[PDB]
Amino acid sequence: PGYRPSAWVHLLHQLPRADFQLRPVPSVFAPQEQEYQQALLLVAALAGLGLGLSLIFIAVYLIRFCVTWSCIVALLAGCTGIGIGFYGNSETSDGVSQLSSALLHANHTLSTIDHLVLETVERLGEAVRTELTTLEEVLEPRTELVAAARGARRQAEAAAQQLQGLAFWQGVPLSPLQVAENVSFVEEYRWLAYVLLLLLELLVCLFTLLGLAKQSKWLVIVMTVMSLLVLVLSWGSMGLEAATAVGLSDFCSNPDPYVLNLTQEETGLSSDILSYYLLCNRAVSNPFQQRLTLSQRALANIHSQLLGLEREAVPQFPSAQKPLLSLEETLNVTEGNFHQLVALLHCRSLHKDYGAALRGLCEDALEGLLFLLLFSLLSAGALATALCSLPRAWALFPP
Amino acid sequence: PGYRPSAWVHLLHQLPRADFQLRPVPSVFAPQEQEYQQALLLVAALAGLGLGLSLIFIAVYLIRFCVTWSCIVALLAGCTGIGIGFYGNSETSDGVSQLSSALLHANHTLSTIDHLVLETVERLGEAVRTELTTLEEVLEPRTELVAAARGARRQAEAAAQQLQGLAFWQGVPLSPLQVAENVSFVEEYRWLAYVLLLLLELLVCLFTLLGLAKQSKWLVIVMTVMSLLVLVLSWGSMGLEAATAVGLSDFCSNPDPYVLNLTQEETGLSSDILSYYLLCNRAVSNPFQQRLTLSQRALANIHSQLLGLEREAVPQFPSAQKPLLSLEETLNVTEGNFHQLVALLHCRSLHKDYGAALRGLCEDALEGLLFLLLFSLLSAGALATALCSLPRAWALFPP
Ligand SMILES: *[C@@H]1O[C@H](CO)[C@@H](O[C@@H]2O[C@H](CO)[C@@H](O)[C@H](O)[C@H]2NC(C)=O)[C@H](O)[C@H]1NC(C)=O
Ligand SMILES: *[C@@H]1O[C@H](CO)[C@@H](O[C@@H]2O[C@H](CO)[C@@H](O)[C@H](O)[C@H]2NC(C)=O)[C@H](O)[C@H]1NC(C)=O
Ligand SMILES: *[C@@H]1O[C@H](CO)[C@@H](O)[C@H](O)[C@H]1NC(C)=O
Ligand SMILES: *[C@@H]1O[C@H](CO)[C@@H](O)[C@H](O)[C@H]1NC(C)=O
Ligand SMILES: *[C@@H]1O[C@H](CO)[C@@H](O)[C@H](O)[C@H]1NC(C)=O
Ligand SMILES: *[C@@H]1O[C@H](CO)[C@@H](O)[C@H](O)[C@H]1NC(C)=O
């Protein structure tokens, strides 16, 4: 099936970006780059200019002055906005949780791969030791039996070498667990902060409602400054989350060799492996293919040689029965482990995890960021109406 | 990792259920046991009883009668409730969409296995034809070359016979695509119905606000019966969704044996296969292992004597040199296809799809159903307050 970028991804991608140092920008995801970071900060600067324009407009309205139902409508609009904000916060938290689970499963898969390789090599080594025991048991050097034993030992050594070569995550500094725990850590703090902001806005709205119901002049003016502060906070939150959404949408564009380049810089793995596990198409062939065949061939060869020692050596050399059964059991166990490894070296083992990671990072996270945008716009409008209405009614109380 | 039942599913599982015929129900998911169906209908009956009690209480309130700010507070409470309803509808739609996507992916996987097995056996048949070509071009029957050719042909036939049985979804009547299509179909119909109900309640709330703001008595009495009807329909929706949530929670608690039995009754494949792909733990073992353990031998075995024809027949039989490359290419393609098949027969992919299906069906669907429960409760409370307040101030409207 694959991953299809959403409509919002292309809608935000086509947006023109500029810088005061140099307006032309490639509009291509590139962290640790001056132009991209400066443009993303300029987006928040534009949001701050919107803050300033709203403040000037409300000040002008108040100076020019210098209906309650409008205030109730504004606070109901704010309640709808904070519901949208709760939805968006839950959505983005779910998306980043999906991302963290994706890297957790990726680490589990890589661990399982290199692990199974490790004990497969260990079992092959124990098979080599028991084969040495069999040769020690072979006192009379028969023309064919010792040759079969030597061939089986060489085949076991070759299979051990190929299995040692199969492991690819061994010896890389990067591990997904360390880059998933930190992202979960940051996401937890971000969710906590936005939940606190949402609760503060709910308290502000409830204070407005209580002051209107109680007809308490004091309450109104006391929390008007808090309303102004939460308006400024919502404006700045819009700027920050809009920059985050723009960056995320630019990252989620259809071409993604950026992830491949970043991983090749960080882990240092060859591009053929990374291309295979990040594309999983018929154009890219398995980098582990040939080796995976060779080892299995050796294994098959071993079994054949084993049957020889099973069909001729056992009646002549009865003491070799138990070690031969030991080799047979090791062969069965290592063939099961080899099948598990081959199942774990396919694209779907990790390409599906990467697809789910991108799903959580775009189809969930970007939608959550847009819902935070809608939160910020609705909250700014509702609080502007509040600072336009409540002062017009503060002194206008019957007592 | 595995599937971990949540707290809500365990909380709803322990609830006691009763039936008018036979009170002690086993409280075990069984869509074929009648007592289960009457037990689930009893929840909707209890919700209807709550409807009746609320109607009696509001009628008593109006009869005993026979502040607007309370009405505004109730309307903002209803706005919060319908926001919760939006969230719950989106959550349950997302969960059922995840289930449908998992079922579609299960189809795509199984189709990949059986189509790939068909392609592999056809390629082995073409290899048999080319081996017959080698046999006919072998005019002089050398004591070793003809024996090697016969052994290669027999090994190819044995490998084809062993591989012909791998496809376990070739003969089953059930198709996951039809199940996914029908569950989707039902899902968008239910989503459309609930979206229409939510918009109807939003219109009711907006009409309430307009009636209070414009002091239009005529409108309020006209839409009072509308509010009563939406109250009744919300109570009925609460009953239906509560029954659905109870059933889903009772299912999600230890669903593996029930799903295994249902799939045994429908597909009728085998005990070992379904248990393997629904458990994927260490205790369950590969049922295809020996099968695969044979095939990967034969193909590899073939390669051995292929080198014989490469090492002795090539200088003697340049005509045989021509199709030997074709045979080797077929061997390479079938080895790649066999590795793909082995990667496709591990429980990891299908059990991962099943785990995602259960995740969407429980950890998302249960949350959606409980958010619908909250929607229903808050909507019932807000509408009860609305029918307790609006008749008071209908005639008390200033004009
Ligand atoms: C997540 O990553 C850590 C760090 O890599 C895993 O710890 C092991 O680290 C060793 C290094 O010698 C590697 O063999 C493997 O990467 C890891 N596996 C084991 C147990 O040997 C840690 O176990 C990983 N956690 C998960 C989810 O598997
Ligand atoms: C989904 O299942 C259907 C039905 O099994 C697949 O459609 C075809 O089904 C017939 C027999 O049922 C077989 O020829 C193949 O299993 C399918 N052939 C083709 C060309 O599709 C369908 O392929 C499955 N997968 C998808 C993605 O639809
Ligand atoms: C990959 O990244 C490095 C530095 O991170 C950069 O120099 C290089 O140009 C990138 N690759 C491509 C193809 O742009
Ligand atoms: C090899 O292991 C498999 C495990 O799937 C088992 O079924 C089979 O009997 C074993 N072979 C022997 C000879 O014990
Ligand atoms: C499986 O289902 C059938 C009918 O659907 C039922 O008769 C049988 O008892 C079930 N299995 C178990 C173990 O209960
Ligand atoms: C067999 O297929 C592999 C996979 O691409 C390839 O690398 C190898 O060269 C092929 N063998 C021959 C003899 O061409």
Author numbering:
A (entry chain B), B (entry chain A): 5 to 70, 90 to 422
Please, what does the article write about this entry?
The Tweety homologs (TTYHs) are members of a conserved family of eukaryotic membrane proteins that are abundant in the brain. The three human paralogs were assigned to function as anion channels that are either activated by Ca2+ or cell swelling. All TTYH molecules are dimers and contain an extended extracellular domain, five membrane spanning segments, and an unstructured cytoplasmic region. In light of its distinct protein architecture and the absence of functional evidence for ion transport, we thus conclude that the TTYH family does not form ion channels and instead confers other catalytic properties.
